[PDB]
Amino acid sequence: KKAVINGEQIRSISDLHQTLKKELALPEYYGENLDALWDCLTGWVEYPLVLEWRQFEQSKQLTENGAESVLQVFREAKAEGCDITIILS
């Protein structure tokens, strides 16, 4: 499916894992951490997935190292062989 990270919307890391959870449609126990988010990409989300990260960096400052991490899991998982077209805006 396709995902969209609206930075102007993100209000905190939890917010990041919230919009993602919607996109990736993670379970209700979506760990929200990188280990969980990842645990979802490598075995949960359906690919090829798109990660249209809008306003990148805007969701990294607020929750310092907040976005740079999830995205790192999206590209890393993309490296795992998954087809997560990482679209950085």
From Swiss-Prot:
It is found in: Cytoplasm. Signal peptide: none annotated. Keywords: Cytoplasm. CDD domains: Barstar (cd05142). Its main location: cytoplasm. GO terms for cellular component: cytoplasm. The keyword Transport does not apply. Belongs to the barstar family. Inhibitor of the ribonuclease barnase. Forms a one-to-one non-covalent complex. This is Barstar. It comes from Bacillus amyloliquefaciens (Bacillus velezensis).
